[PDB]
Amino acid sequence: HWGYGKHNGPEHWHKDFPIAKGERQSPVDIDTHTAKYDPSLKPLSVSYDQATSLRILNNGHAFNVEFDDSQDKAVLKGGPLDGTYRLIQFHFHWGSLDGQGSEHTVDKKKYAAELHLVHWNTKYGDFGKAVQQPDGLAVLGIFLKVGSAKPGLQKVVDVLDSIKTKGKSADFTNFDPRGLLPESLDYWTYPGSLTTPPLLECVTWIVLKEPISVSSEQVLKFRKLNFNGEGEPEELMVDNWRPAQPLKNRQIKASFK
Ligand SMILES: NS(=O)(=O)c1ccc(C(=O)NCC(F)(F)F)cc1
Ligand SMILES: [Zn+2]
Predict the structure, then answer these.
(1) Which residues, if any, are the signal sequence?
(2) DSSP state letter for 112
(3) C-alpha 231 to ligand 2 mean position (Å)
(4) Active site residue 14
(5) H or E stretch including 205?
(6) CB of 42 within 8 A of CB of 79?
(7) How many helices and strands, by DSSP H and E, does the chain display?
(8) Is the CB of 127 inside a 6 Å radius of any atom of ligand 1?
(9) Which domains does the chain have, with CATH numbers?
(10) Residues flanking ion ligand 2, Cβ below 5 Å
(11) Separation of 39 CA from ligand 1 center, angstroms?
(12) Whose C-alpha lies nearest to ligand 1, atom 4?
């Protein structure tokens, strides 16, 4: 179906998913001079102490670390959000080279990669109902730059060999996603969409200002993954990012002065 190549990449997606040309698409460029500080924005509450990771899956577009979301364990609250959003999975988008890979950009600057921690609003009961609602998801986005290693990422990098190709999964219990956060939780926020088909307009985006640093060796391991299934021709999983989309009639708000 859809993917990231010239024949099936982002510029094609609108033919099967016409919302691609919609009014609240993601990602976007964050213009730091135009985003306005909103003193009414609350601190984010990231409550991940009770997180229960279960499995890691190569789905042919990225790899997802999945959590048990059958109760209010790992949740995101506060900031621009009303109510409680449960962590369901995280994944990354990254580049073939260090100068590209993020989906959001900051003053047109691309980072090497971007982590998305995906949460759904518990008022809608299940994830499939939530993605049908304009306030159904909250995705916490964190930029990755290349520098020092991120110790809390190494457990993820070391299992990637076992899920090299599409449809492979592995047990992945006891992973603590607090080890992927930066020091500061200052953020930008705007209403947007899923960045992969079906491109549903159901996301409150919360993008942290402070990137995390990962090492060149860590990001090199992401780039050894494959988009293809086992035995099929090898296509390295790189450049699985959607470019910035028109901001249209939206305002990006900053939590910080
Ligand atoms: N974080 S993100 O890249 O915008 C992103 C997060 C989640 C999903 C997702 O659950 N797609 C499967 C669904 F909902 F069945 F359509 C897609 C994109
Ligand atoms: Zn994503």
Answers:
(1) none
(2) S
(3) 27
(4) no
(5) strand 203-208
(6) yes
(7) 3, 15
(8) no
(9) 1-257 (3.10.200.10)
(10) 116
(11) 30
(12) 194
Resolution in Å equals 1.4
For ligand 1, atom 8: residue with the closest CA:
194
Contacts of range 3-11, beta carbons closer than 8 Å, 24 or more positions apart:
3/60, 3/61, 3/227, 4/61, 4/227, 4/239, 4/240, 4/241, 5/235, 10/242, 10/243
Helix (H/G/I), strand (E/B), else coil: 73: coil
What is the Å distance from ligand 2's center to 56 Cα? 15
Residue 116 assigned to a binding site? yes
- The amino acid sitting at 249 is N
**Is the separation of the CB atoms in 221 and 157 below 8 Å?**
yes
Tokens at 64, concatenated: 């997802």
Please report the sign of the dihedral spanned by the C-alpha atoms of residue 256, residue 196, residue 111, residue 244: negative
Q: Which of 197, 194, 227, 166 is nearest to 2 (CA)?
A: 197
Q: How was this structure determined?
A: X-ray
Cα of 137 vs centre of ligand 1, distance in Å, is: 9
Q: Closest ligand to 59 CA? A: 1
Torsion of CA 245, 13, 137, 168, to 10 degrees: -130
**Cis before 191? omega within 30:** no
Ligand 1 close to Cβ of residue 133 (< 6 A)? no
CA gap 256, 209 in Å, rounded? 9
Establish whether the linkage from the previous residue to 27 is cis, with ω within 30° of 0.
Answer: yes
* C-alpha–C-alpha distance, residues 26 and 135, integer Å: 15
| Nearest bound ligand to the CA of residue 138 | 1
The tokens describing 133, both together, are 């609602």
Cβ atoms of 116 and 90 closer than 8 Å: yes
Half-sphere exposure of 219 (CA within 13 A, CB side): 30
